[PDB]
Design an enzyme around this catalytic site. Sequence first.
Site, PDB file in Angstrom:
ATOM      1  N   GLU A 163      -9.648   2.282   7.778  1.00 21.82           N
ATOM      2  CA  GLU A 163      -8.502   2.481   6.808  1.00 21.82           C
ATOM      3  C   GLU A 163      -8.475   2.272   5.434  1.00 21.82           C
ATOM      4  O   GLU A 163      -8.088   1.544   4.763  1.00 21.82           O
ATOM      5  CB  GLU A 163      -7.362   1.356   7.296  1.00 21.82           C
ATOM      6  CG  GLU A 163      -7.018   1.650   8.788  1.00 21.82           C
ATOM      7  CD  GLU A 163      -5.797   0.728   9.187  1.00 21.82           C
ATOM      8  OE1 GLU A 163      -5.607   0.992  10.364  1.00 21.82           O
ATOM      9  OE2 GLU A 163      -5.416  -0.382   8.674  1.00 21.82           O
ATOM     10  N   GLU A 351      -7.297   2.474  17.202  1.00 21.35           N
ATOM     11  CA  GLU A 351      -6.211   1.146  17.215  1.00 21.35           C
ATOM     12  C   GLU A 351      -4.894   1.776  17.577  1.00 21.35           C
ATOM     13  O   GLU A 351      -4.370   2.919  17.107  1.00 21.35           O
ATOM     14  CB  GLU A 351      -6.105   0.694  15.948  1.00 21.35           C
ATOM     15  CG  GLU A 351      -7.401  -0.467  15.438  1.00 21.35           C
ATOM     16  CD  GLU A 351      -6.984  -0.959  14.137  1.00 21.35           C
ATOM     17  OE1 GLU A 351      -5.805  -1.448  13.993  1.00 21.35           O
ATOM     18  OE2 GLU A 351      -7.885  -1.387  13.439  1.00 21.35           O
TER      19      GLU A 351
HETATM   20  O1  LIG Z   1      -1.166  -4.477  11.650  1.00 23.82           O
HETATM   21  C1  LIG Z   1      -1.840  -4.628  12.757  1.00 23.82           C
HETATM   22  C2  LIG Z   1      -3.324  -3.984  12.726  1.00 23.82           C
HETATM   23  O2  LIG Z   1      -3.299  -2.713  12.170  1.00 23.82           O
HETATM   24  C3  LIG Z   1      -4.432  -1.763  11.736  1.00 23.82           C
HETATM   25  O3  LIG Z   1      -3.975  -0.910  10.928  1.00 23.82           O
HETATM   26  C4  LIG Z   1      -5.547  -2.724  11.123  1.00 23.82           C
HETATM   27  O4  LIG Z   1      -6.814  -2.168  11.086  1.00 23.82           O
HETATM   28  C5  LIG Z   1      -5.527  -3.971  11.798  1.00 23.82           C
HETATM   29  O5  LIG Z   1      -6.548  -5.076  11.220  1.00 23.82           O
HETATM   30  C6  LIG Z   1      -4.326  -4.581  11.890  1.00 23.82           C
HETATM   31  O6  LIG Z   1      -4.425  -6.348  12.230  1.00 23.82           O
END
Ligand SMILES: OC[C@H]1O[C@@H](O)[C@H](O)[C@@H](O)[C@@H]1O
Length: 445
Positions: A163, A351
């Site tokens: 990100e 993610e």
């Molecule tokens: O917000 C929850 C998660 O969102 C993602 O975009 C991030 O890479 C994580 O590190 C974060 O904890």
Amino acid sequence: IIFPEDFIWGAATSSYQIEGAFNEDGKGESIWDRFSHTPGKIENGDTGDIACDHYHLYREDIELMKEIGIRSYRFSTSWPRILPEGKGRVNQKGLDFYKRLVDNLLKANIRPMITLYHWDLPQALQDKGGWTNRDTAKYFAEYARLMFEEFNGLVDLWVTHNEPWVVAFEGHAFGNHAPGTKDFKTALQVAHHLLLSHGMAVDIFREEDLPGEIGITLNLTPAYPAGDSEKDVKAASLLDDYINAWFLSPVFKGSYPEELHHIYEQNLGAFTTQPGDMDIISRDIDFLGINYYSRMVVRHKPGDNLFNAEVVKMEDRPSTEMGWEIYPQGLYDILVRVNKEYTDKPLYITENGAAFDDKLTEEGKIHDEKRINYLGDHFKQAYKALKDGVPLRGYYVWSLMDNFEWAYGYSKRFGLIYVDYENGNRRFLKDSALWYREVIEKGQV
Ligand SMILES: OC[C@H]1O[C@@H](O)[C@H](O)[C@@H](O)[C@@H]1O
Ligand SMILES: C[As](C)(=O)[O-]
């Protein structure tokens, strides 16, 4: 709804959010050590000093991975645990931890995916300007080479950056994240160097000739017009370029988005680039990682900011504990768009997940049905994208366990696994973990 039997179901974490051991075994200070030790930056004054203590507990955590049956585990490696000064002499004990971790994963038939940079820059490099200093890009590439050399034939899935939008803008424009700078011009210069450092590592990856695949991970937030207005449409388009195209276009087309680049340059002046930078940034990569949580609804609004646009709060739609709209359709839309507009390369959801107000009951269970419904609905959209021809190869749930949610501290729980911090840091499988276990066995939702 049935996925391919070889579909890569996983779970994800990052180093600062779970490891603890913040000054142990020769590890150097990171910008997140510094930031969290600064009063007023983190909710409740939480720090990552101990967190889940994964640095000491990783063998127990791998046992829980096996219980869920994830096929791949996405984690990040701490640059300052391995190179305390960000350059120079390797800290052998720090590196030994990741060697032990990877050996244990392979023994468990869990395929590792390493993220080289998930936001914990060496404070030593921040003191020399951090990501506004082009040397930081060079030292990142050198750190990448070290890791490629050490895990040649052990790790075959690599992500350079997590990100870069967030690193640039939350870290340096709005100051919500380490290092906590609040200067939009700095954020643009940072973004460029993050992109540059990515291409530099890709070049090294090819030269070192390891077997495996390398990519980058982008947070993508699809934008939708609040109304039929052609002005609301342009407004959403600009905010879509702000977050998504600003990194997608350089990586896959070798250019920044034109109108937005113009708007920035006119108001802030030009950030510093060298000729040939776009060539490096746009090196061929093997896959794209997408982090998806929500969408944004956008209306035109001439005054408030540079894009003359503001985001609309969908107050009549369900949201998570973060206040983010739950919008599963957005995951389909963004997979389809990326495949149509930017790349035909394999895609991974690196993610996706949600925070809810998880309650540990009076013996060891967590009935997080909202998380089950959230993941289920998003898995279904991934299936639809698959069916429609998107080359989606894997899906990593954020997160394997509750952890340090950055500026929110431990107040926000994203895990499949509940972490009872105060009681020996003990772990409990949530109902969503038992549910995910069933999904992976069958490959069916
Ligand atoms: O917000 C929850 C998660 O969102 C993602 O975009 C991030 O890479 C994580 O590190 C974060 O904890
Ligand atoms: C990605 As190119 C060859 O236009 O720099």
